CSV table of C-alpha atoms in Angstrom, one decimal:
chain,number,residue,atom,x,y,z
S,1,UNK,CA,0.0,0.0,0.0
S,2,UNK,CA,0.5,3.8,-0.4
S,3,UNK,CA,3.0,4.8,2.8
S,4,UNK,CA,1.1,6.1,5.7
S,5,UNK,CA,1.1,6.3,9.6
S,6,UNK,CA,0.1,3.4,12.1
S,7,UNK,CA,-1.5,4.5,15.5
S,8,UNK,CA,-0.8,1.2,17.4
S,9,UNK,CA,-3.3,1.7,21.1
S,10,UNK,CA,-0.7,0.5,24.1
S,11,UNK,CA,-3.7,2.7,26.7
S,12,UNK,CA,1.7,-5.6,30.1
S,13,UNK,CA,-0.1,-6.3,26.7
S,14,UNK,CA,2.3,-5.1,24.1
S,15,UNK,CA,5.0,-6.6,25.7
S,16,UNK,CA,3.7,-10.2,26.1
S,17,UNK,CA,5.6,-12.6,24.0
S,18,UNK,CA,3.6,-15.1,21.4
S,19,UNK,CA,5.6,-17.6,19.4
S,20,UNK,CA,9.1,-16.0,20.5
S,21,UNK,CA,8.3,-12.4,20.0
S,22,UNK,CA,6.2,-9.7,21.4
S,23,UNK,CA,2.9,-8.5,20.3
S,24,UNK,CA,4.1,-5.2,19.5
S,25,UNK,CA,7.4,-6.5,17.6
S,26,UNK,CA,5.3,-8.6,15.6
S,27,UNK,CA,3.2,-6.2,13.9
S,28,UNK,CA,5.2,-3.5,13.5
S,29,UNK,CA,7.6,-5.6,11.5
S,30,UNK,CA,4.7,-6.6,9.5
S,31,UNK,CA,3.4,-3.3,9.3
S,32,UNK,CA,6.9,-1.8,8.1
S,33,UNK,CA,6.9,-1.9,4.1
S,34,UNK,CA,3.8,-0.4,4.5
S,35,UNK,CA,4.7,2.4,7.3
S,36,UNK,CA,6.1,5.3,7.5
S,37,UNK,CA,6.0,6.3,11.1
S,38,UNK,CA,4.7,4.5,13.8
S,39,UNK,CA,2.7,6.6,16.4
S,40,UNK,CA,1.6,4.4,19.6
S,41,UNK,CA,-0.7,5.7,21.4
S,42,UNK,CA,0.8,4.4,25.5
S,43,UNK,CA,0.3,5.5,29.4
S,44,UNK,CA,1.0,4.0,32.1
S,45,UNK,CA,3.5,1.9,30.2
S,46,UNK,CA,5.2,4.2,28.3
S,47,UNK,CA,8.6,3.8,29.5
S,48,UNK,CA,9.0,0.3,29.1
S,49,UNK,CA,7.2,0.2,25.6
S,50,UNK,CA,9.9,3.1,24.5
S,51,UNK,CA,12.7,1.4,25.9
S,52,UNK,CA,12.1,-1.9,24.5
S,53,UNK,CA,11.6,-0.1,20.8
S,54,UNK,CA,15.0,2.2,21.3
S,55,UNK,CA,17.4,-0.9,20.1
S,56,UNK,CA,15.0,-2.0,17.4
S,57,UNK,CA,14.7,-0.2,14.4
S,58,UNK,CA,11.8,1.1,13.2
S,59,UNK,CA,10.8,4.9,12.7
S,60,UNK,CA,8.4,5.5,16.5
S,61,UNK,CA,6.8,8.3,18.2
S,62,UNK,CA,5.7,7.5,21.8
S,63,UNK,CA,2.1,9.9,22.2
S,64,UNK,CA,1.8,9.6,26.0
S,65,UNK,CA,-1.5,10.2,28.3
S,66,UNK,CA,-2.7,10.7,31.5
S,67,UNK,CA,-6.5,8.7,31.3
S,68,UNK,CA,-6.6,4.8,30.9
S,69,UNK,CA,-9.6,5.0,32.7
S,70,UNK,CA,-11.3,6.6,29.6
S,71,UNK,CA,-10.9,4.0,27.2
S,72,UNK,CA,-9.4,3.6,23.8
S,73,UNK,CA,-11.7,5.8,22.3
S,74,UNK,CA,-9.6,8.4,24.0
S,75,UNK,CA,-6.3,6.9,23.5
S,76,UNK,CA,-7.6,7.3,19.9
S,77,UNK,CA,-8.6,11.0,20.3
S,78,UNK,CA,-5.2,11.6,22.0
S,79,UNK,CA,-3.7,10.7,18.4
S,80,UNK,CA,-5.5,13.2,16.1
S,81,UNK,CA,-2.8,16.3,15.9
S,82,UNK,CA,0.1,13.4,15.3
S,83,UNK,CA,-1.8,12.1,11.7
S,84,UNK,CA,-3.5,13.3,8.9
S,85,UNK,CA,-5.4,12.0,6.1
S,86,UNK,CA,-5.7,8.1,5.9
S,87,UNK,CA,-4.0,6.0,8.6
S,88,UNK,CA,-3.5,2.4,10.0
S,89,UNK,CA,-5.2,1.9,13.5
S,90,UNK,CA,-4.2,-1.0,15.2
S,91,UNK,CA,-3.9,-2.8,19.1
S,92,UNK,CA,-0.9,-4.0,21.1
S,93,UNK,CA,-3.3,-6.5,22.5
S,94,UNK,CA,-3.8,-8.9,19.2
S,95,UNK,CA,-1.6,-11.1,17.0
S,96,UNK,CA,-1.4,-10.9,13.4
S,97,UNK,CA,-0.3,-13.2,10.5
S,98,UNK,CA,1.5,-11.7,7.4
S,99,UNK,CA,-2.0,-13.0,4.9
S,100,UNK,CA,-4.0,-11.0,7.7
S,101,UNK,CA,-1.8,-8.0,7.4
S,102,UNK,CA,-1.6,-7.7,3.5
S,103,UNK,CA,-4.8,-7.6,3.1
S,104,UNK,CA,-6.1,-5.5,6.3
S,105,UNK,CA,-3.9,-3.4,5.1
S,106,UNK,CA,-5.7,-2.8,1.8
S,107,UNK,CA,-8.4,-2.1,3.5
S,108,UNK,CA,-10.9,0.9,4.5
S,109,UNK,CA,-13.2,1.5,8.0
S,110,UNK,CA,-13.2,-1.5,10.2
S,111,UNK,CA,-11.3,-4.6,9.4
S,112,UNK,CA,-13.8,-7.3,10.3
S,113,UNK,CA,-13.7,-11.2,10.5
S,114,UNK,CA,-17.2,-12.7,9.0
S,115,UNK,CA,-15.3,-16.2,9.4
S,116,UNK,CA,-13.6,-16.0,12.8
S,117,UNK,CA,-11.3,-19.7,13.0
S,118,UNK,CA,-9.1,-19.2,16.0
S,119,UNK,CA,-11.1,-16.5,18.3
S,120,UNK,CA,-14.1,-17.5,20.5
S,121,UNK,CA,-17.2,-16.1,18.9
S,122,UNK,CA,-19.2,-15.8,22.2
S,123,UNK,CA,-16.3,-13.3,23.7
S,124,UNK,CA,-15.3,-11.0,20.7
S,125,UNK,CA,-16.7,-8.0,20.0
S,126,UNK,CA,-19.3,-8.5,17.2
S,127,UNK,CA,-20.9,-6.4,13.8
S,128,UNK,CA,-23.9,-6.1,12.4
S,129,UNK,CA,-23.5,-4.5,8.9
S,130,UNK,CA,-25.9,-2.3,6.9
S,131,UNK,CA,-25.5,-1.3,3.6
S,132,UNK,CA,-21.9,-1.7,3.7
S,133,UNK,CA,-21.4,0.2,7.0
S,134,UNK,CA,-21.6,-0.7,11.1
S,135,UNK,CA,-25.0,-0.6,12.3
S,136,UNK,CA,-24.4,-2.0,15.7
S,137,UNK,CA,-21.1,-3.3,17.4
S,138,UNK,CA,-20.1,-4.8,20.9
S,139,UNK,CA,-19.3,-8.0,22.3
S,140,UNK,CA,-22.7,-8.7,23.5
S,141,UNK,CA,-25.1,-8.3,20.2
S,142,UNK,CA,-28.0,-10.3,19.5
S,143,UNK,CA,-27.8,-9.8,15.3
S,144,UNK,CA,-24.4,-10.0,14.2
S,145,UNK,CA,-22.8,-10.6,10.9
S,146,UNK,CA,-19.0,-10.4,11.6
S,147,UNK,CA,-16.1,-10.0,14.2
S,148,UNK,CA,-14.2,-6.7,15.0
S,149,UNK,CA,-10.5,-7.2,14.7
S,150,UNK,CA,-8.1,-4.4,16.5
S,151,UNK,CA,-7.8,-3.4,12.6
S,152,UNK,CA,-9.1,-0.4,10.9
S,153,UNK,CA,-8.0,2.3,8.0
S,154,UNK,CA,-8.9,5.5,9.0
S,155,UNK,CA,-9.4,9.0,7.7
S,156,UNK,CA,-9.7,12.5,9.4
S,157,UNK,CA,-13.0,12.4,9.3
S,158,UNK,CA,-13.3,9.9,12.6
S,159,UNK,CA,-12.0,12.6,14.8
S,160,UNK,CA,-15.5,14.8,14.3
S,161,UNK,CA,-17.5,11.6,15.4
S,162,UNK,CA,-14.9,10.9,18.8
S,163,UNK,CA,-15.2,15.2,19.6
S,164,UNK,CA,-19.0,14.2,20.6
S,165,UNK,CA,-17.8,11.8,22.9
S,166,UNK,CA,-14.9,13.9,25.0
S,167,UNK,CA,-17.7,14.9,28.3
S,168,UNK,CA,-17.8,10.9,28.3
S,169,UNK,CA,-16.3,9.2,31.8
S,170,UNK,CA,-15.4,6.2,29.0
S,171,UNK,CA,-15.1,6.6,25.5
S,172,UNK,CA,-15.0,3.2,23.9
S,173,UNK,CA,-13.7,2.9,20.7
S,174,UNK,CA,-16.7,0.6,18.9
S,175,UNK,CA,-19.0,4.2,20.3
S,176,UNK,CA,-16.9,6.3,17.7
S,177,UNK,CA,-17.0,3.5,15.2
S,178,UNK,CA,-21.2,3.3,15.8
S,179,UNK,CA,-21.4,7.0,15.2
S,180,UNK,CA,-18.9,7.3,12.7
S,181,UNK,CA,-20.9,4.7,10.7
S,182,UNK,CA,-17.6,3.6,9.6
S,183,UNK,CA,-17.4,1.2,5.9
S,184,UNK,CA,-16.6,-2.2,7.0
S,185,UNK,CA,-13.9,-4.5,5.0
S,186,UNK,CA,-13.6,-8.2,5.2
S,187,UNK,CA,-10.4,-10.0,5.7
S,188,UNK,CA,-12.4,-13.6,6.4
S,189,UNK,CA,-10.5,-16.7,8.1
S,190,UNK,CA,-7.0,-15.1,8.2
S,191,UNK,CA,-5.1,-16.1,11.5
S,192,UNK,CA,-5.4,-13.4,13.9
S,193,UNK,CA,-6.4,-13.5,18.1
S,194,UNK,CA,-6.2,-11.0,21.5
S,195,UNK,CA,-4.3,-12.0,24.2
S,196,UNK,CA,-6.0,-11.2,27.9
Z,1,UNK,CA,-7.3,-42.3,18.9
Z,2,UNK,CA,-7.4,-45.4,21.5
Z,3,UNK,CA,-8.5,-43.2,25.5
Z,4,UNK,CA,-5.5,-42.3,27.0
Z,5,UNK,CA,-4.5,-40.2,29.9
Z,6,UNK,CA,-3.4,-36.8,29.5
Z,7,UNK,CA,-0.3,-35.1,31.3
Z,8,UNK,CA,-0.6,-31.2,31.1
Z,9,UNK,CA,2.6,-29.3,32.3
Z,10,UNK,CA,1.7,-26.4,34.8
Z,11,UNK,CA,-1.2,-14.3,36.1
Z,12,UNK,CA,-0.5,-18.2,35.7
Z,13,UNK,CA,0.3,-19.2,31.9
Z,14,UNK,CA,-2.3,-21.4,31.3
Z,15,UNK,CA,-5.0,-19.2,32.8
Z,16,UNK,CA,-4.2,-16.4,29.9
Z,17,UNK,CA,-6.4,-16.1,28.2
Z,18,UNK,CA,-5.9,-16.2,24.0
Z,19,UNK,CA,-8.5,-15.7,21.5
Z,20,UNK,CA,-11.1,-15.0,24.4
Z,21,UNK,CA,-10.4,-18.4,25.7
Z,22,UNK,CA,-7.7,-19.7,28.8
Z,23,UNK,CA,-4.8,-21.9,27.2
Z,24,UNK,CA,-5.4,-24.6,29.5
Z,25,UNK,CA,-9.4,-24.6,28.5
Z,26,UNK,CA,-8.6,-25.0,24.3
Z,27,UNK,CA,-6.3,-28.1,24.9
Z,28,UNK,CA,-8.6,-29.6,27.4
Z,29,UNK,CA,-11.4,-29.1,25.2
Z,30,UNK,CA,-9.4,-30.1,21.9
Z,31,UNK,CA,-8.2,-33.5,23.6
Z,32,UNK,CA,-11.5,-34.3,25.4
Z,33,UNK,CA,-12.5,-36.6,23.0
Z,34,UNK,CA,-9.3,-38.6,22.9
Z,35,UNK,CA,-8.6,-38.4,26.5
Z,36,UNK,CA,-9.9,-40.7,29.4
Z,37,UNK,CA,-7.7,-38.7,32.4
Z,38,UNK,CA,-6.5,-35.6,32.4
Z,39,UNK,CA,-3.2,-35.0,34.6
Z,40,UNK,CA,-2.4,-31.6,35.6
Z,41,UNK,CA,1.4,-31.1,37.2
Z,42,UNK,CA,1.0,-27.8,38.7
Z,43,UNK,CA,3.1,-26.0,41.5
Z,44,UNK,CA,2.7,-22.8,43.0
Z,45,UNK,CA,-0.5,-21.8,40.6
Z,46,UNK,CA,-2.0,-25.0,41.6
Z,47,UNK,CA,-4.9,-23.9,43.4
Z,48,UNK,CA,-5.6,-21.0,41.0
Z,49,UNK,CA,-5.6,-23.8,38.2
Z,50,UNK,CA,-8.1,-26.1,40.3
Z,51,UNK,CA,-10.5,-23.5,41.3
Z,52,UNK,CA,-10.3,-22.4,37.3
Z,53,UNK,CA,-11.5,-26.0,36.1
Z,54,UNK,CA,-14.0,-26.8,39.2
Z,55,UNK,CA,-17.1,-25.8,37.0
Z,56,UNK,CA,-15.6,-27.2,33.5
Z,57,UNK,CA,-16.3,-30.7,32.6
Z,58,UNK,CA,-13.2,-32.6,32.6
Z,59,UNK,CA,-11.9,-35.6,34.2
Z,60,UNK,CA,-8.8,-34.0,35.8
Z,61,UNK,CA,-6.5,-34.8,38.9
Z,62,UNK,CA,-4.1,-31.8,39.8
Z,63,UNK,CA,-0.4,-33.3,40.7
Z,64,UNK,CA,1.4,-31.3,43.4
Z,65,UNK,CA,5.1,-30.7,43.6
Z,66,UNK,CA,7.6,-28.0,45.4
Z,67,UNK,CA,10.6,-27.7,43.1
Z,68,UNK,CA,9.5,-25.6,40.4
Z,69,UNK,CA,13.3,-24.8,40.2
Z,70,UNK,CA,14.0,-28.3,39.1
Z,71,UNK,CA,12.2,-27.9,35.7
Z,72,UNK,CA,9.7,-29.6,33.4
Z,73,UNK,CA,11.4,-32.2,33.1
Z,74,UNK,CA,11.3,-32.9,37.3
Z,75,UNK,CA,7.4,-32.0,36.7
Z,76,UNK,CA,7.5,-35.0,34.1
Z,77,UNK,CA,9.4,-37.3,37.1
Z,78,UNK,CA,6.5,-36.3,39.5
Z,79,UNK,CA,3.2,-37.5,37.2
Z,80,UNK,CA,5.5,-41.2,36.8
Z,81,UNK,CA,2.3,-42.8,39.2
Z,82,UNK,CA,-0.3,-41.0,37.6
Z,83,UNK,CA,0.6,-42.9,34.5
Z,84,UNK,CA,0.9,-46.5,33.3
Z,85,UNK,CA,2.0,-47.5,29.4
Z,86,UNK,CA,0.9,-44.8,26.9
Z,87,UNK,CA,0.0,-41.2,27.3
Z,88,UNK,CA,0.1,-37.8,26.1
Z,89,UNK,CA,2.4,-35.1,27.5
Z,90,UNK,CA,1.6,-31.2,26.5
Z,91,UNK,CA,2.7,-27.7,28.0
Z,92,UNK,CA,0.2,-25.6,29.9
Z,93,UNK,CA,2.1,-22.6,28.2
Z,94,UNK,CA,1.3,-23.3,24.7
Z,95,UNK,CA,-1.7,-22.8,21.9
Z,96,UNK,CA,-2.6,-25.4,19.5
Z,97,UNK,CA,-5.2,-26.0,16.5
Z,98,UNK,CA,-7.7,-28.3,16.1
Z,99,UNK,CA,-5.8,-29.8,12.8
Z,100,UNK,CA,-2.6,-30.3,14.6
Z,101,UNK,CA,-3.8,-31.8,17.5
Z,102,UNK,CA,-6.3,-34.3,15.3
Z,103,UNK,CA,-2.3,-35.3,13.9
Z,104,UNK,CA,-0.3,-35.0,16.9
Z,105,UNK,CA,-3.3,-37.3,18.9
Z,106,UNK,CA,-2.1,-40.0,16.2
Z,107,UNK,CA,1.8,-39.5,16.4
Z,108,UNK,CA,4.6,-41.5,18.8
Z,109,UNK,CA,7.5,-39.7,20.8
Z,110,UNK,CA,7.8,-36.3,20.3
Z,111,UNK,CA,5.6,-34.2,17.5
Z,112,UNK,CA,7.9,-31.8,15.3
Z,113,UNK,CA,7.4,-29.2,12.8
Z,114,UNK,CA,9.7,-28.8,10.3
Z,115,UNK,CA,7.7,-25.8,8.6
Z,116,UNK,CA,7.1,-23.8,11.6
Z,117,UNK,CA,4.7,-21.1,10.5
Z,118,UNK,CA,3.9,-19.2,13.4
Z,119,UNK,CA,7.1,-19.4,15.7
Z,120,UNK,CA,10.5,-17.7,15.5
Z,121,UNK,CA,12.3,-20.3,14.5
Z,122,UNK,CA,15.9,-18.4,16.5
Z,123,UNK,CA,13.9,-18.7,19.5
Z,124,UNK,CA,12.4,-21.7,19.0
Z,125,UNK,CA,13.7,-25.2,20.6
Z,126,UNK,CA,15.4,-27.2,17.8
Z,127,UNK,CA,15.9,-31.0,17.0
Z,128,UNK,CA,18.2,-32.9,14.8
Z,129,UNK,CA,17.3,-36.1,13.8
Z,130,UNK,CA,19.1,-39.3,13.3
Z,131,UNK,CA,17.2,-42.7,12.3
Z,132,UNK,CA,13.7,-41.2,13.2
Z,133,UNK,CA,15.2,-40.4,16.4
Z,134,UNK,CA,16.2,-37.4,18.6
Z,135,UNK,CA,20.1,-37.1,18.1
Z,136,UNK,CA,20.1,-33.3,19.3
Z,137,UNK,CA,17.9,-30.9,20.5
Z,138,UNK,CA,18.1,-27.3,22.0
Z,139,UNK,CA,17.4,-23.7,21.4
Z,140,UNK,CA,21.0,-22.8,20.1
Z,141,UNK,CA,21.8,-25.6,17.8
Z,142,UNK,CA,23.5,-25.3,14.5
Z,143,UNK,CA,22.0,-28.5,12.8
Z,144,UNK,CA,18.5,-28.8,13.0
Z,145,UNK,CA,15.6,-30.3,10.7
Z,146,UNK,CA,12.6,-29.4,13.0
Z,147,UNK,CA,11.2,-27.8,15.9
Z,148,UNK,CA,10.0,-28.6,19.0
Z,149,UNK,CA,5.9,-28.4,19.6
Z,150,UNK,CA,5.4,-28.9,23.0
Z,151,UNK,CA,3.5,-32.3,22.5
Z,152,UNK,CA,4.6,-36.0,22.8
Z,153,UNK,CA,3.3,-39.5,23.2
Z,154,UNK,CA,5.1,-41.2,25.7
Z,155,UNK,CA,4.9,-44.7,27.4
Z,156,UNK,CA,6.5,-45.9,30.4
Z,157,UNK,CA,9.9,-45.8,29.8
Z,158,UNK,CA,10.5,-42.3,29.6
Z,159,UNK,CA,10.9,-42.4,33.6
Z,160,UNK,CA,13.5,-45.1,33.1
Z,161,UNK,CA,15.7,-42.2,31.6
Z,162,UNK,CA,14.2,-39.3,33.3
Z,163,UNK,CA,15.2,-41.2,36.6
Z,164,UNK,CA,19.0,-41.0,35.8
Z,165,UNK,CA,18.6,-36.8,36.2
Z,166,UNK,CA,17.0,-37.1,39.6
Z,167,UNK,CA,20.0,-35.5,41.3
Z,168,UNK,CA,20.8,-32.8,39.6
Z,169,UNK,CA,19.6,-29.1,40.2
Z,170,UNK,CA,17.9,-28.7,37.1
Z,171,UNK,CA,16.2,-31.5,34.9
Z,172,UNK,CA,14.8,-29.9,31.4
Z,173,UNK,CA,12.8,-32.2,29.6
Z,174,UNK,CA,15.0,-31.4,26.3
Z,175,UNK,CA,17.5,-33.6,28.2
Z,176,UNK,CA,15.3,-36.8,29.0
Z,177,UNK,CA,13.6,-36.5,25.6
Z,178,UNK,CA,17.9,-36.5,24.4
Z,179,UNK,CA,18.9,-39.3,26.5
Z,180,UNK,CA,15.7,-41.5,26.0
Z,181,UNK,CA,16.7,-41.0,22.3
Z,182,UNK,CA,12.7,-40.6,21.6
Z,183,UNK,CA,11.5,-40.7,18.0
Z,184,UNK,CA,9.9,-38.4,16.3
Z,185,UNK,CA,6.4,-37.6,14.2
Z,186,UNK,CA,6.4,-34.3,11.8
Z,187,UNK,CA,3.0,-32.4,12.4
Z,188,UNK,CA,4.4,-29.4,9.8
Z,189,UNK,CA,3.0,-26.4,9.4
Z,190,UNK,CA,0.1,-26.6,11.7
Z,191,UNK,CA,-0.8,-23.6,13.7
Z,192,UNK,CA,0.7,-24.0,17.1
Z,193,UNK,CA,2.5,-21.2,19.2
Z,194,UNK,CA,4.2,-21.0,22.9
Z,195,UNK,CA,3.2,-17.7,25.5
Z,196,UNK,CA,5.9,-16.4,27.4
C-alpha cells in the first residue's frame, strides 16, 4: 500500500511474547513496508514500551496520556494532531499473521472477521452490517454478521464523530466506530487472536 | 485415537487467556474426546488452576510438587504414578489447533514441525534427527531439521531415563527426551505457538 502512519493503542499487553516475539514487535515488523511512522498511542506503560523499541529499528513516536480509565476511544482521540489523512489503527493486545496484514492493510473503515477460525465467537466484540457500513457493534449483540479485529483504515473524518464523545467518563472505541458509521472490509478466516 | 491419559505441564500461563479463551481450557477441550484422564502437574499456581477447572467438565487430577526450580522435566518425574503405558504429555504454556492436535493425537515420541509457521524459529527449541530419532535438541543448535511443539506421546519408559537426572539441580525435559533418544512424528505447518 501507499505509505502512511500506524496508530498502534498500548492505553503488560504489548509486551507479552507469542511464538518468540512480542505483540508489538510482531506487527510493526509486518506493518513496516507499508509504514512510515509508527505513532503508539501508551500511558502507564510508556517507558518500558519506549525502551524496548530504542534498540530496534523502526521509525516510532511514543504519544503519551494521562487517562486509561477513559478507554481507547480516547487513546484514539489523544492521536488526532500526530496524523493526517488516511492512517492504519491497530492494538498492542492482538496477533497478526503476514496473509491477515496484507490484506487489512488494503483495506478501509473496520477490518472485520465474517469467518472467525481461532477466536471465541461468544467473547469477541461483534458487527452487524448495513448497507456496507456498522449498524451495531459490541461484544454482546443479538444480530451479528462479523467479528471486529483491532484493525481499521482510517481517515480524518473519525476525529469529528470521537469530539462528541470527549464529556464521556469512557469513550469506547466501537461508540466512535457506531457513530462514525464507519465502511466495513472483510479479511475472512485469516489467522489473527487477543491476548487477555 | 485409543482413551488415554493426558499429562498437562503447569497471572499463571495457562490461565491467559488467547483468543477469548484460557490456554489450559482450548487443549482440554481439543483432547477431550481422545482423552480418558487428564493430569495436571502444577506448582505454585495449583490452586488457581483447580478452582479455574471446578465448574468445567473434565476428568482432571491436579499433581502437586515443590521444586519448580527443578524444571519440566522434574514435573514429568512427578506424574511417573499418575501414569501407566501410553499417554500424552503437552505444556500448559502453549496454543494449538484443532488440525494439529487431530495429527499429533495420532503421532509416537515427540511431535515436530519442520515448517514452523507461526514461531521464531531463532527462538524456537530445535531437534536434529538421526534414524527417526532425537540425536540433538536445544534452542542454540547449528544442525537442526525441525522444531519442538510442545507435544509427545510417551509410554512408560520415559521415567526409566528421566530417573537418571534425579540429582541434579535442574532437569529440562529437552535432556530426558535427548537421553531416551525418543522418535519423532512431523505435524508441519500446523498452527501452534508457545506464551511467554
Amino acid at each position: 500500500i501507499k505509505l502512511m502512519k500506524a496508530v498502534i493503542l498500548a492505553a503488560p499487553k504489548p509486551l507479552v511474547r507469542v511464538g518468540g516475539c512480542e505483540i508489538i514487535l510482531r506487527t510493526m515488523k509486518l506493518l513496516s513496508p507499508h509504514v512510515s511512522e509508527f505513532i503508539i498511542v501508551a500511558s502507564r506503560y510508556a517507558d518500558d514500551i519506549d525502551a524496548f523499541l530504542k534498540d530496534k529499528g523502526f521509525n516510532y513516536k511514543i504519544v503519551r496520556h494521562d487517562r486509561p480509565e477513559k478507554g481507547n476511544g480516547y487513546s484514539l482521540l489523544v492521536a488526532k494532531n500526530h496524523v493526517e489523512d488516511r492512517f492504519i489503527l491497530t492494538m498492542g493486545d492482538h496477533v497478526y499473521s503476514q496473509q491477515f496484514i496484507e490484506k487489512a492493510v488494503r483495506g478501509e473503515g473496520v477490518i472485520a472477521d465474517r469467518e472467525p477460525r481461532f477466536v471465541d465467537i461468544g467473547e469477541a466484540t461483534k458487527i452487524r452490517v448495513e448497507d456496507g457500513r456498522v449498524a451495531k457493534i459490541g461484544k454482546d449483540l443479538r444480530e451479528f454478521d462479523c467479528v471486529d479485529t483491532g484493525f481499521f483504515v482510517l481517515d480524518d473524518s473519525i476525529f469529528e464523530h470521537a469530539e462528541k464523545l470527549r464529556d464521556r467518563e469512557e469513550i469506547p472505541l466501537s461508540e466512535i466506530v457506531k457513530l462514525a458509521r464507519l465502511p466495513v472490509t472483510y479479511v475472512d478466516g485469516e489467522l489473527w487472536m487477543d491476548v487477555d
